[PDB]
Ligand binder design. Sequence first.
Ligand SMILES: CC(C)CCC[C@@H](C)[C@H]1CC[C@H]2[C@@H]3CC=C4C[C@@H](OC(=O)CCC(=O)O)CC[C@]4(C)[C@H]3CC[C@]12C
Ligand SMILES: CC(C)CCC[C@@H](C)[C@H]1CC[C@H]2[C@@H]3CC=C4C[C@@H](OC(=O)CCC(=O)O)CC[C@]4(C)[C@H]3CC[C@]12C
Ligand SMILES: CC(C)CCC[C@@H](C)[C@H]1CC[C@H]2[C@@H]3CC=C4C[C@@H](OC(=O)CCC(=O)O)CC[C@]4(C)[C@H]3CC[C@]12C
Ligand SMILES: CC(C)CCC[C@@H](C)[C@H]1CC[C@H]2[C@@H]3CC=C4C[C@@H](OC(=O)CCC(=O)O)CC[C@]4(C)[C@H]3CC[C@]12C
Ligand SMILES: CC(C)CCC[C@@H](C)[C@H]1CC[C@H]2[C@@H]3CC=C4C[C@@H](OC(=O)CCC(=O)O)CC[C@]4(C)[C@H]3CC[C@]12C
Ligand SMILES: CC(C)CCC[C@@H](C)[C@H]1CC[C@H]2[C@@H]3CC=C4C[C@@H](OC(=O)CCC(=O)O)CC[C@]4(C)[C@H]3CC[C@]12C
Ligand SMILES: CC(C)CCC[C@@H](C)[C@H]1CC[C@H]2[C@@H]3CC=C4C[C@@H](OC(=O)CCC(=O)O)CC[C@]4(C)[C@H]3CC[C@]12C
Ligand SMILES: FC(F)(F)c1ccccc1-c1cc(C(F)(F)F)c2[nH]c(C3=NOC4(CCCCC4)C3)nc2c1
Ligand SMILES: FC(F)(F)c1ccccc1-c1cc(C(F)(F)F)c2[nH]c(C3=NOC4(CCCCC4)C3)nc2c1
Lengths: 103, 566, 52
Amino acid sequence: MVAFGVARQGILRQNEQRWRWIFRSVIYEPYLAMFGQVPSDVDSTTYDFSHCTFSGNESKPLCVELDEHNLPRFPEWITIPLVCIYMLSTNILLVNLLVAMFG
Amino acid sequence: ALIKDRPKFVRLFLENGLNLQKFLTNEVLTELFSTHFSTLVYRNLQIAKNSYNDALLTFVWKLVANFRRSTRHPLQALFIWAILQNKKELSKVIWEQTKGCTLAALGASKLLKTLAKVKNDINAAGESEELANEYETRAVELFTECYSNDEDLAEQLLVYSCEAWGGSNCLELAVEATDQHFIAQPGVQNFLSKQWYGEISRDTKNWKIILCLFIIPLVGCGLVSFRKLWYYVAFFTSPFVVFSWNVVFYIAFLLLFAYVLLMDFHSVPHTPELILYALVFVLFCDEVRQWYMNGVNYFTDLWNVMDTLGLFYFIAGIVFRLHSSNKSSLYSGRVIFCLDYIIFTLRLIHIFTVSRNLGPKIIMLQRMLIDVFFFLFLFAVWMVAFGVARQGILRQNEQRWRWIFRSVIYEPYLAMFGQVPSDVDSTTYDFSHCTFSGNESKPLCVELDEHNLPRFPEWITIPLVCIYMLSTNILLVNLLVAMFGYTVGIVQENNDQVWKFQRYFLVQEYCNRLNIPFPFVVFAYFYMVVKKNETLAWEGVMKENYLVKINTKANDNSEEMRHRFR
Amino acid sequence: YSGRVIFCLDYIIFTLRLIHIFTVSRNLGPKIIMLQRMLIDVFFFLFLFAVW
Ligand SMILES: CC(C)CCC[C@@H](C)[C@H]1CC[C@H]2[C@@H]3CC=C4C[C@@H](OC(=O)CCC(=O)O)CC[C@]4(C)[C@H]3CC[C@]12C
Ligand SMILES: CC(C)CCC[C@@H](C)[C@H]1CC[C@H]2[C@@H]3CC=C4C[C@@H](OC(=O)CCC(=O)O)CC[C@]4(C)[C@H]3CC[C@]12C
Ligand SMILES: CC(C)CCC[C@@H](C)[C@H]1CC[C@H]2[C@@H]3CC=C4C[C@@H](OC(=O)CCC(=O)O)CC[C@]4(C)[C@H]3CC[C@]12C
Ligand SMILES: CC(C)CCC[C@@H](C)[C@H]1CC[C@H]2[C@@H]3CC=C4C[C@@H](OC(=O)CCC(=O)O)CC[C@]4(C)[C@H]3CC[C@]12C
Ligand SMILES: CC(C)CCC[C@@H](C)[C@H]1CC[C@H]2[C@@H]3CC=C4C[C@@H](OC(=O)CCC(=O)O)CC[C@]4(C)[C@H]3CC[C@]12C
Ligand SMILES: CC(C)CCC[C@@H](C)[C@H]1CC[C@H]2[C@@H]3CC=C4C[C@@H](OC(=O)CCC(=O)O)CC[C@]4(C)[C@H]3CC[C@]12C
Ligand SMILES: CC(C)CCC[C@@H](C)[C@H]1CC[C@H]2[C@@H]3CC=C4C[C@@H](OC(=O)CCC(=O)O)CC[C@]4(C)[C@H]3CC[C@]12C
Ligand SMILES: FC(F)(F)c1ccccc1-c1cc(C(F)(F)F)c2[nH]c(C3=NOC4(CCCCC4)C3)nc2c1
Ligand SMILES: FC(F)(F)c1ccccc1-c1cc(C(F)(F)F)c2[nH]c(C3=NOC4(CCCCC4)C3)nc2c1
């Protein structure tokens, strides 16, 4: 969880500057990914915005880094495989290993 | 008798008054090695020495060649001669005479193990393997007897180094021949534990010493039992405390790395980033020292390669991010740093293989890769089939690689854990996300017949997805669970024995170094660059005791009654 | 379109042939072979599931 959350947050948003949301993104969401929901809906560019906050005034996650124009700057070809591997590892392999050790 | 392989007659001659020490003479040994050495065995030994080679292979080959051409340790030469021609009883008879036997037995087992692989014959390979196992058991039993009788002398014998038998101790030969059983025995483990705790007593509660690590003044008090100021030096020189300090330093380094990466990362590096660079520099210096100590064999381990890759990734990230003028490079440098952070963070699993509670379970992970591979093979085949079929029947002439791969592979893969593979399989809901043209970044529309009605039939799609989900999400996962359970049950009995070997590797590698706390080891390396018999007799006595024990165990059959009846 | 659908089903059939051909790998073959012995458990599972 630590590795995945830190990497994802670093590549996606920049200079968060709010402790509660740093900890919410880094730990809470990967933890929720253990049972069910995919860790991040932001890993895919197909859908984004309308929940973003360029400033920190509101209580929402910091926006994604943007290059020239409004297009997101993060590449999907490094995010999607990362989340796929993380889910395949946590949600399936580890739980089955726990079952075997319990048995 | 030696020529004709008469073990019993050899024993009788030796025990009836013959002086073997005087027997073995330079001329006699030269005549014995020069000619009686089997030509087949001679060629095989030459090939093995020339091709594979080893710390002891070269030594034995050189000794053999020297004797053929023309202290001394002649009895060891005779024992080697007997072993190399596969004489079990004669080899044992000669072994019973050597002053140092445990080392001799381990060396013989190593030699047999290295010579058995080359031989193509199956039966000869099996015989050599059996002989090597017999010698390994002999050495283990002898050392157990020695340790049970006397402990300090057993440890001294372990530490004792030969005068060019192989230039190595029993530990080195046992580890080199991957003799897990010998090292796993209680005596060697206790010796390693004593060396691991250093000065500190082994009976102290671990939490006491961990607590004392943080608060310095607590060490001066009597909380720590030093007996197995001077206390500070005796404490900070213990490899256990150095390892704990290095772990703490590494964790703090990770915290600083994460903080700089996410919270404070600007075009021009600030002070915390420079401190991070300094810490990475000391880590790189340690890695360079580790490179120097070993050769290219150091790169044969996965974790070492991973660490080297992490360091090179850090250097690359530094290179990319110094172009403060161009924004497009700072982001790439940050991404490189994120990947390097993943690599560094995965190192905790490697370092925590010594915890005595997590280490065995971490070690056993390497044995489930075949089950994982089979699972992935079936999953990939099914995903390919289902995705190709569904895409073909639903949309036509996609003509965009990224979306072909997104639909064919990504969605069926997501179907493994949770969501149904496709919301398009059902006509009840569709459109408002379609794109007849490829201009937008959305999946291609479904094929349409006359009117706007979808053309695909549900009676072939819905059963397909139902079968695919029933297969992947339930059956395959349960099969994986069952295979994992069986593998754990099989390998648990050997996991601890395997883990003790790695424990020895740690307890030797850490003790070998100068044992300076990590944050300021640079000064040590810099000024080092500037500066850059009786036990054998006791072993023989215990060997005699062990042989007498074997003879008594053999005679315990109690069959003498019938012989006395006759 | 019907021909394309037939081709898709035939593609599934052909793709399933890899499991058969890879029964000789000396690492996957035994595990593939053992699958034939769990059909009764699968059948019992499906029987209960269908009734419920
Ligand atoms: C390594 C093992 C343990 C698990 C791997 C799971 C696979 C399902 C991963 C491996 C590589 C992944 C692919 C790598 C690259 C891409 C392109 C990506 O499409 C893009 O948006 C690329 C960037 C762009 O838009 O140009 C969609 C996912 C896909 C097919 C990834 C989806 C899932 C794949 C096949
Ligand atoms: C200084 C700040 C930033 C870190 C605070 C986090 C702590 C919860 C970490 C820091 C150092 C860690 C310790 C470093 C080393 C060890 C020894 C380890 O046990 C062994 O390695 C014994 C080896 C053996 O049995 O041979 C158990 C955890 C402990 C106390 C670790 C547990 C968690 C600690 C206290
Ligand atoms: C929170 C983010 C922004 C910074 C990353 C901090 C990490 C370095 C911390 C977070 C969770 C911590 C871990 C939580 C669980 C464990 C296992 C634990 O292992 C043991 O104590 C072994 C005990 C035994 O076997 O006897 C040591 C502390 C460690 C690595 C903790 C110390 C370091 C970790 C990875
Ligand atoms: C190109 C994109 C996908 C980003 C690449 C970054 C990570 C996804 C890479 C960097 C290091 C890789 C890891 C290196 C080592 C391993 C252990 C491996 O499992 C084992 O080897 C268990 C046996 C053992 O202990 O060695 C599974 C993959 C993993 C986590 C690798 C998977 C992918 C990782 C995390
Ligand atoms: C074969 C084993 C391993 C698993 C099978 C799972 C069952 C739950 C499948 C087998 C046949 C399937 C049925 C085959 C045909 C249809 C009609 C289908 O309704 C239609 O839309 C048909 C086309 C039309 O609209 O006219 C709804 C699903 C249903 C009941 C399918 C739903 C699920 C069923 C019962
Ligand atoms: C991607 C779509 C559009 C085209 C379909 C290509 C398939 C033919 C590829 C995709 C995934 C591939 C497979 C991924 C995993 C495996 C298992 C692997 O099995 C072994 O190597 C056995 C090793 C051993 O047991 O020693 C051989 C390659 C194979 C069939 C790969 C080769 C062919 C596959 C099915
Ligand atoms: C009419 C609609 C639902 C489309 C039909 C196409 C597929 C759904 C059919 C074509 C071939 C069929 C497969 C033929 C063989 C098998 C193996 C069978 O499992 C075993 O027999 C294991 C033992 C063995 O190795 O033989 C489970 C069903 C499956 C995948 C069959 C299920 C349905 C498949 C994939
Ligand atoms: F049960 C289990 F442990 F899963 C497992 C069971 C059987 C065989 C292997 C494993 C295993 C072991 C390790 C290791 F021992 F090496 F840690 C794994 N590591 C990872 C990943 N590393 O990083 C990821 C998360 C962070 C982002 C990058 C990807 C996932 N997946 C592993 C699977
Ligand atoms: F654990 C497991 F393996 F599930 C399994 C466990 C116990 C008994 C049988 C199986 C098994 C084996 C195979 C085979 F060995 F034959 F491959 C299976 N094949 C399929 C399917 N084939 O194609 C589908 C995906 C592609 C679309 C059409 C349907 C599902 N389900 C299987 C179940």
